[PDB]
């Protein structure tokens, strides 16, 4: 088992949980749960949402 990172929130995915989503152009993503899934499908920038890791790292919080 290898531990992989959520493509939206940057959180840490354990083997049992999450979903994985492959697009037509390749570029397979992995999502921790349906909240991240819906945000990604709605095409929101993770840099603008407070509870992810990209936002926290770009605001130095």
């Amino acid at each position: 088992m290898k531990v992989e990172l959520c493509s939206f929130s940057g959180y840490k995915i354990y083997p049992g949980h999450g979903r994985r989503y492959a697009r037509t152009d390749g570029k397979v993503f992995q999502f921790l749960n349906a909240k991240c899934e819906s945000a990604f499908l709605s095409k929101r920038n993770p840099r603008q949402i407070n509870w992810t890791v990209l936002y926290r790292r770009k605001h130095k919080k």
């Binding site: 083997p15 049992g16 949980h17 921790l32």
Partner: protein, 394 residues
């Protein structure tokens, strides 16, 4: 005329008296058959359902698509403190069946077991076995007792020991213990009786009954679901939308000329809370409980040899609706009958099991302990705090 398009029956007629169980704990309908060749032992035990969990292991079966790969398998946790033995019953086999010959109880019986003997413990004056316990300290009483033992030894064929659970080692609300008969299988009647009477009045753990990586049978009562209709108790197809007087029904209750309705036609009634038994449930792990040594509490139950963390079997926030598993437990494959906190009988396999999936050796790699009270992300509190950093409340 005939049914134009054939279709198989809905439901099985082998579970027909689809009524509420007359019992709360499962009763072993048939114990494993005896042979004198093997050493004496027990054949059943009693535990409590706690919850389900993830498991990551490496499969070992040649010729498979998942050979030497890694799969996740849901497991059931059955918290299981050692029982304590309080009695012996002998049975004699008759042309009319099998009848109880004689029963012998222990000198000391805990209030946990005494509670089982009353339907109102608060009001009682707690007189159970008060006059019986004097048969043990009296010379005449004990010689009559050993006469009883010898009579059992030379007249009985099968021996069943009485054991009850320890409810003070569980987070459950009730203090009334569960009492059960477990068949002693193995050598001759004399050896079985000596074994039973030499550890009468003391404790029996789980590892002495069940071994790691063994397939057992699980007996218990399913979850209750109340009064339910045919479309959910028997799973008949729903009628179309245009139907006038309700669509969650079965249309044809029977043909005309047999002027009654048969036992086989699906009807509405009690669903669930039936007595069931499931065979071939495999044990992945027999974990010991929290123990104490050198003033330090060792708890790393869910620690594997590929993980080496100190996490216990309890997920963050505890098992939902159940509590904390502090004493010994067993880990079975898949789901068992019953709800949370339900008492659950475990028994040895009846049929002999010589097959590949029955002889696979189980080696665990990871035990998921994320919180089940929602979408959990962290295996341990230390990991959670290390990832998140200091909070305002700190």
């Amino acid at each position: 005329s005939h049914r134009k398009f054939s279709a198989p029956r809905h439901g099985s007629l082998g579970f027909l008296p689809r009524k509420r169980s007359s019992r709360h704990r499962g009763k072993v309908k048939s114990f494993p058959k005896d042979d004198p060749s093997k050493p004496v032992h027990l054949t059943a035990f009693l535990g409590y359902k706690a919850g389900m969990t993830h498991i990551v292991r490496e499969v070992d079966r040649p010729g498979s698509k998942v050979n030497k790969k890694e799969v996740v398998e849901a497991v059931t946790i059955v918290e299981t403190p050692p029982m304590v033995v309080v009695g012996i019953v002998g049975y004699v086999e008759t042309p009319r069946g099998l009848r109880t010959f004689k029963t012998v109880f222990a000198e000391h019986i805990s209030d946990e077991c005494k509670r089982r003997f009353y339907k109102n413990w608060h009001k009682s004056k707690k007189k159970a076995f008060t006059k019986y316990c004097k048969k043990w300290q009296d010379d005449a009483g004990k010689r009559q007792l050993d006469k009883d033992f010898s009579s059992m030894k030379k007249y009985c064929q099968v021996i069943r020991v009485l054991a009850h659970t320890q409810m003070r080692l569980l987070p459950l609300r009730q203090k009334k213990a569960h009492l059960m008969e477990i068949q002693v299988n193995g050598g001759t009647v004399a050896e079985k009786l000596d074994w039973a009477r030499e550890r009468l009045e003391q404790q029996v753990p789980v590892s002495q009954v069940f071994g790691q990586d063994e397939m057992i049978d699980v007996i218990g009562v399913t979850k209750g679901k109340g009064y339910k209709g045919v479309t959910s108790r028997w799973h008949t197809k729903k009628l179309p939308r245009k139907t006038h007087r309700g669509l969650r029904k079965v249309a044809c209750i029977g043909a005309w000329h047999p002027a009654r309705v048969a036992f086989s036609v699906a009807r509405a009634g009690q669903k669930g809370y039936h007595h069931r038994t499931e065979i071939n449930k495999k044990i992945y792990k027999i974990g010991q409980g929290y123990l104490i040594k050198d003033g330090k509490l060792i708890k790393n139950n869910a620690s594997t040899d590929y993980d080496l963390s100190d996490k216990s079997i309890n997920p963050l926030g505890g098992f939902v609706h159940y509590g904390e598993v502090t004493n010994d437990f067993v880990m079975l494959k898949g789901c068992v009958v019953g709800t949370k906190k339900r008492v659950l009988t475990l028994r040895k396999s009846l049929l002999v099991q010589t097959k590949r999936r029955a002889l696979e050796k189980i080696d665990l790699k990871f035990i998921d302990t994320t919180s089940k009270f929602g979408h959990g992300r962290f295996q341990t509190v230390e990991e959670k705090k290390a990832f998140m950093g200091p909070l305002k409340k700190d």
